Amino acid sequence: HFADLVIQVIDELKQFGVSVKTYGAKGDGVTDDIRAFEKAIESGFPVYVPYGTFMVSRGIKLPSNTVLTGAGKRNAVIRFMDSVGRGESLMYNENVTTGNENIFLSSFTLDGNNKRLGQGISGIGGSRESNLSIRACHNVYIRDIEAVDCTLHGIDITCGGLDYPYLGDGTTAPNPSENIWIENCEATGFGDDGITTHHSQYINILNCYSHDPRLTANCNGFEIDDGSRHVVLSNNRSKGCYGGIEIKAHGDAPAAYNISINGHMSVEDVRSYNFRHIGHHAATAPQSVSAKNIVASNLVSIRPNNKRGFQDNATPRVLAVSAYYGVVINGLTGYTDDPNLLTETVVSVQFRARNCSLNGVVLTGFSNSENGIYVIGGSRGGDAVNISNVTLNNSGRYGVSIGSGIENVSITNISGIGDGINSPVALVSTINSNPEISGLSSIGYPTVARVAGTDYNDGLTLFNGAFRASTTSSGKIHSEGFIMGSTSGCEASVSKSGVLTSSSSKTSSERSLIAGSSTSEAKGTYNTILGSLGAVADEQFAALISASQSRASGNHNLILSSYGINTTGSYKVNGGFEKINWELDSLNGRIKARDTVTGGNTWS
């Protein structure tokens, strides 16, 4: 009775706000405390949850402008009673359809008591039965919450409605959640995903730990799902899930877009980083209009495996990209100490993934996998895959393998050690004949580069398109042409034409070369102009060597050592000075001089 009076004084002090115990909460692990929570929450004061295990017979419903703070994880614990039926998340905002505003949740454990339902049980339908569900809310801060024994998800951010909407690709669901911060939270023992987002935007997930789902379906640590956009994940860890971070959508929904991963650590997940859009992977169906923009950096993947048998024994991956446009990966380290856990492909880019770049990758220990990096395309216009600055330490019988449908690949600065690999084949392999490649270095791979069946073991540099080097300006260069070592005014405008070491010299001659020349022009076919000034070759097989101010216009007509002559004869070699002075006539077997032809000569 005296104690009651002292407590009344303490309560009135409101040192933390109002304690739930002030409204009758026992926190004794037995008594139903729901009414105390509802009373405290409806009072308008910030609510404090002190030490205890606070049992509730139904979900805790949160109105707008709620502050709910506990004494800390495994200190303040909130828990469903054994007798609770189906349908409710443990904690969720009051207005399920159009949402609430300004909800600040901190420092307690949510224990969903899934075990009360027996084993192997997940959510009854849609977004129902997570530990924490936030639906259509603006301005929600979720901090230092531990979510355990969850029926559906640990923490779910979604749009209005108990069900998830399936409106088709290219849509935006009404009533998104917006401005959400999830920090220093933990999710484990969940039936679907640890921390997940749907149909919501402007979300930061920082320093959280999601691990060990109860089930072996599509059970992910962090699941950026249907309708998500404008999300940052940073410095989180996942462990022992299917996907570490999954970014996706189901088929009848828009894929998450514009997602940033600013560092992550994945420990013994199946597919550490798994980006996909279900239903938008086949070549015979349209591209996803939603699956776009993922920038992911400083990614760690450790011992990816499928010991638990997730997803019908799906094969492990450090990284798997499918469906998405515009995925940029920078700074990826994959490490394993057990060669038998992942034996197919370490990193895959396939199934309509397009315009993807990988830079700064180290893959170590995958000595019984078939491929380190494996890429497949669809011969799509404007597509590209860039792979640079990759080092492989006993990872992949094929280090970097490029398959069919890839027309635009850049592969630069790849190195590999294959001495510890079970039956290595090639550091780099391509199906397509025209990859761009440079900077390959290897030891212990029998072949370094296999390009469309041809092996290169002593280094290679391959570039595509019109080529120009050591020339500061030029006119047009054909894609099967080149200009090198020249000054201004040159052009090599047709297939198989080129200019070397020249000035103001142009070729429009299919199968031709101009070298060492000035103000010269080739415009027939099979033309050669060498060491000449003001030379023109304008007929098939016409040529000039060491000639000035001369034009060879004959079929197979070659001019040598001449100035100021124009020749038109077929199969003739000519020379002269201001006029034709000799001829070797291959056609008729005649030799002609303007002056004399003589034997018995000396040169003294």
- Candidates 287, 177, 295, 285; CA nearest to 226 is 177
Please report which helix (H) or strand (E) contains residue 111, including its range: strand 101-111
Give phi and psi for 2, each to the nearest 5: -65, -45
Chain centroid, CA 368 distance in Å? 24
Which residue's CB is nearer to a copy of itself, number 57 or number 364? Answer: 364
Q: Taking a C-beta distance cutoff of 8 angstroms, is the pair 252, 166 a contact?
A: yes
The Cα 303–Cα 370 span in angstroms is 16
Q: How many CB atoms lie within 10 A of CB 604?
A: 3
* Segment interacting with a copy of itself, rule: CB under 8 A, options 90-98, 128-136, 271-279, 289-297: 289-297
Taking the least distance from each CB to a copy of itself, the nearer of 219 and 492 is 492
Distance, in Å, from the CA atom of 347 to the CA atom of 371, rounded to the nearest integer, reads 8
- Residue 599 within binding range of a copy of itself, rule CB under 8 A: yes
Q: What are phi and psi of 311, to 5 degrees?
A: 55, 50
Residue 218, contacted partner among a copy of itself, Na ion, none, CB below 5-8 A by kind: Na ion
Is residue 283 a contact point for a copy of itself (CB under 8 A)?
no
Could you tell me which stretch among 244-252, 308-316, 368-376, 470-478 binds a copy of itself (CB under 8 A)?
A: 470-478
Query: Site mask, a copy of itself, residues 218-257, x = CB under 8 A?
Result: -----------xx-x-xx-x-x-----------------x
Question: How far from the centroid of its chain's Cα atoms is residue 576's Cα?
Answer: 66
Ligand-binding site membership of 578 (annotated): no
Among residues 149 and 192, whose Cβ is nearest to Na ion? 192
> HSE (CB half, 13 Å, CA atoms) of 450?
17
If contact means CB under 5 to 8 A according to the sort of partner, which of Na ion, a copy of itself, none does residue 210 touch?
none
Q: What span, in angstroms and rounded, lies between the C-alpha atoms of 470 and 485?
A: 5
Question: Of these partners, a copy of itself, Na ion, none, which one is at the site of residue 176 (CB under 5 to 8 Å by kind)?
Answer: none
Binding a copy of itself by CB under 8 A: which of 161, 243, 481, 534?
481
d(CA 306, CA 304): 7
| Out of 384, 431, 447, 553, the residue judged to bind a copy of itself by CB under 8 A | 384
**Bridging pattern class, strands 178-183 and 195-197:** unpaired
CB 96, min distance to a copy of itself, A: 24
225 contact, one of Na ion, a copy of itself, none, CB 5-8 Å limit per kind: Na ion
Burial of 313-331, coded b for 16+ CB within 10 Å and e otherwise, reads ebbbbbbbbbbbbbbbbbe
Q: Which of 145, 224, 267, 270: binder of a copy of itself (CB under 8 A)?
A: 267
Cross-strand pairs, 28: 53
Q: φ, ψ for residue 588 (rounded to 5)?
A: -110, 0
Please say which residue, 312 or 337, places its beta carbon nearer to a copy of itself.
337
Among 36, 55, 157, 332, binds a copy of itself (CB under 8 A): 332
CB of 569 to a copy of itself, least distance (A): 8
Q: What is the 3-state secondary structure (H, E, C) of 176-209?
A: CCEEEEEECCEEECCCCCCEEECCCEEEEEECCE
- Residue 193 contact, options Na ion, a copy of itself, none, Cβ 5-8 Å cut-off depending on partner type: Na ion
378 contacts which partner out of a copy of itself, Na ion, none, CB within 5 to 8 A by kind? none
Count of positions on this chain that bind a copy of itself (CB under 8 A): 207
The response to whether 183 counts as a known ligand-binding position is: no
102 versus 311: smaller Cβ distance to a copy of itself: 102
Report the partner that residue 582 touches, choosing among Na ion, a copy of itself, none (CB closer than 5 to 8 A by kind). Answer: a copy of itself
Residue 287 near which of Na ion, a copy of itself, none (CB within 5-8 Å, type-dependent): none
CB 336 within 8 A of CB 364: yes
Contact 262, 232 (CB under 8 A): yes
Q: Which residues, numbered 398-437, are part of the site for a copy of itself (CB under 8 A)?
A: 408, 410, 412-413, 415-418, 433-434, 436
Asked whether position 43 contacts a copy of itself by CB under 8 A, the answer is no
> Is 168 a binder of a copy of itself (CB under 8 A)?
no
Q: Does residue 416 contact residue 397 with C-beta atoms inside 8 Å? A: no
Is 88 annotated for ligand binding? no
Rounded CA-CA distance 227/166 in Å is: 9
DSSP secondary structure letter of residue 130:
-
Residue 167 interacts with a copy of itself (CB under 8 A): yes or no? no
Q: Note the residues at the interface with Na ion (CB under 5 A).
A: 192-193, 218, 220, 223, 225
Residues 6+ apart with CB under 8 A from 85: none
* 289: contact with a copy of itself by CB under 8 A: no
Closest CB to a copy of itself among 76 and 96? 76
Smallest gap from Cβ 92 to a copy of itself, in A, equals 20
| Contact positions with a copy of itself (CB under 8 A) in 68-127 | 69, 71-75, 102, 104, 106
Q: Pick the piece of the chain touching a copy of itself (CB under 8 A) from 84-92, 119-127, 313-321, 492-500.
A: 492-500
**Single residue of 39, 281, 496, 523 touching a copy of itself by CB under 8 A:** 496
Q: Which does 314 bind (CB under 5 to 8 A by kind): a copy of itself, Na ion, none?
A: none
Three-state SS annotation for 27-94: CEEEEECHHHHHHHHHCCCCEEECCEEEEECCCEEECCCEEEEECCCCCEEEEECCCCCCCCCCEEEC
Among Na ion, a copy of itself, none, the one that 192 touches (CB under a kind-dependent 5 to 8 A) is Na ion
Least separation in angstroms between CB 500 and a copy of itself: 6
Rounded to 5 degrees, what are φ and ψ at 8?
A: -55, -40
Minimum Å distance from CB 521 to a copy of itself? 14
Binding-site residue ranges: 198, 223, 225
Binding-site residue ranges for Mg(2+): 198, 223, 225
